[PDB]
């Protein structure tokens, strides 16, 4: 038993991390087959950031201006192009460590593992959620740009996130691996509004089921509620609306625990209206929302990979 | 910026995980050079658990009774022995993926990453602390035994923990890689007392420095205190005594932030006596104690490995 915020094993992704340098800027790249992917602002100087014309800046670059380091191997760059906000460098050697992989654009509320890297070398791995407002609450220092987020399904790494920037509020923003930002953000050093975040209600419910499975059950009340009545409470507390699709997704956890979803909603309603009164649930004094229903099922069924 | 509970990149450890079977029992083993390490209770049946005579049980086994699976390769077992609570199986092939490694026995309050595994295959990775009472609060299902905890220093994996059991209270217990349990525990399916746990005070202070570094600073008060006066508060709240060795370890964080350690103790005193009043620190509504001072320095200096 026990329940922890667990990241995927990172070895498959470690073997794909390279160092990309163009001018004075060095960041991380992702090396799959004979292509290296990285944020296009690798070509920006200091002045360039406030108002970059990426097309004009890229035209001043040729293949030999991009230095790509894989540990200590050089890839020769034999072509380059810009795809949205990512640069794709064609190299002369396919990564011998390329895992089975896919590029996916995840939905808000979904979770993934981040392999934080600096100068092309992995530093650490942690799990997090794409917020409803398309930011992530990560741990990214200078040089972490180009670090990736991912999920694993048996042998297949599904890359979904590449890190580009920290907003002036200190939250993090980035793209899918086709270079399209999540959210309204642009790769410009300007102040940018993330907008109101909300709590991922279906994830909180999944975590409450995780808690029941693991013996923590004081919050189970002797009430039930309806969808419309619960959702009335959700909007007051900035929780995202609960749909029947959400109810269906919680089904297996409902069947395992013998607790109807709407009964669990009534417990969450009373938690939201009356607080936790200094108690804890799975070791936290807050309602946790970065576990999907699949995260929970996977953790207490012990699904493995490689 | 940002601060997250970060595990080490697990790739170096992934390549060492094997499946060990003896009779009906299958668990994880750790394959380094030509030796495989695993919990000795792999030789136990169901009845054996309550009162195992490990010496007598092991004598009924020969080399060919141990089935070792590395993905799909067999190691031939050419020798076996029991070292404290671990079994060491000599195999005919050295692991081609053996990292630079060491066996270390960690101190209570130190942290490490766990690579949770089932049937020899990695499932997930998370960070945690050896509690003062020599348990860990992990996530371990049936078949997770033999999963390891570890730290990395550049290229060297320092193995410090192998998982053996869940106590009836649901916390977790295990050994170093020489097979000596952390704590008073034995590998017997009996009820066993962990004893009173305490909060790792020096880790809480390191995390408060992490918070200041990352903009969270409401808790900084206009008080100071002394060691003896703070420690008086610590014992009332089951915090481990703060020593000058602890103060010295917090020095670099003191110098970075410009906050004397005893000034931070006075903030922690008022947090302990008056609660948090519904505020949060680095996203948590509780005082976090599973970050060492070195964890904090490493996270906000971006130290890398391999
Ligand atoms: C890239 O490694 C780095 C990662 C930052 C530093 C600390 N935390 C992070 O997530 N980010 C950057 O340097 C980029 C650079 C850039 C260049 C050209 C166009 C857009 C961005 N930007 C960035 O994160 O700046 C921080 C910031 C904070 C507040 C307002 C503006 C910018
Ligand atoms: C090994 O994979 C397994 C891991 C447990 C299961 C769920 N969570 C865990 O950490 N543990 C065991 O099966 C061992 C077996 C054993 C055999 C011989 C001597 C000692 C132990 N024991 C165990 O964890 O049992 C759980 C338990 C709970 C409460 C009281 C006694 C035992």
Curated annotation (Swiss-Prot), chains A, B:
Residues 1-306 form the Peptidase C30 domain. Residues 1-306 are cytoplasmic. 3CL-PRO exists as monomer and homodimer. Only the homodimer shows catalytic activity. Interacts with host FBXO22; this interaction promotes the proteasomal degradation of nsp5. The active site is at 41 (for 3cl-pro activity), 145 (nucleophile). Changing residue 90 to R: In strain: Beta/B.1.351. There is a cross-link at residues 5, 90 (Glycyl lysine isopeptide (Lys-Gly) (interchain with G-Cter in ubiquitin)). It catalyses: TSAVLQ-|-SGFRK-NH2 and SGVTFQ-|-GKFKK the two peptides corresponding to the two self-cleavage sites of the SARS 3C-like proteinase are the two most reactive peptide substrates. The enzyme exhibits a strong preference for substrates containing Gln at P1 position and Leu at P2 position. Changing residue 145 to A: Complete loss of 3C-like proteinase nsp5 cleavage. It comes from Severe acute respiratory syndrome coronavirus 2. It comes from the Viruses. Inhibited by pyridone-containing alpha-ketoamides compounds 13a and 13b. In turn, alpha-ketoamide 13b (tert-butyl (1-((S)-1-(((S)-4-(benzylamino)-3,4-dioxo-1-((S)-2-oxopyrrolidin-3-yl)butan-2-yl)amino)-3-cyclopropyl-1-oxopropan-2-yl)-2-oxo-1,2-dihydropyridin-3-yl)carbamate) inhibits SARS-CoV-2 replication in human lung cells. Inhibited ex vivo by michael acceptor inhibitor N3. Inhibited ex vivo by compound 11a and 11b. This is 3C-like proteinase nsp5. Changing residue 49 to A: Does not affect ability to cleave and inactivate human TRMT1. Cleaves the C-terminus of replicase polyprotein at 11 sites. Recognizes substrates containing the core sequence [ILMVF]-Q-|-[SGACN]. Cleaves and inactivates human TRMT1, preventing tRNA guanine(26)-dimethylation of tRNAs. May cleave human NLRP1 in lung epithelial cells, thereby activating the NLRP1 inflammasome pathway. May cleave human GSDMD, triggering alternative GSDME-mediated epithelial cell death upon activation of the NLRP1 inflammasome, which may enhance the release interleukins 1B, 6, 16 and 18. Also able to bind an ADP-ribose-1''-phosphate (ADRP). It is found in: Host cytoplasm; Host Golgi apparatus; Host nucleus.
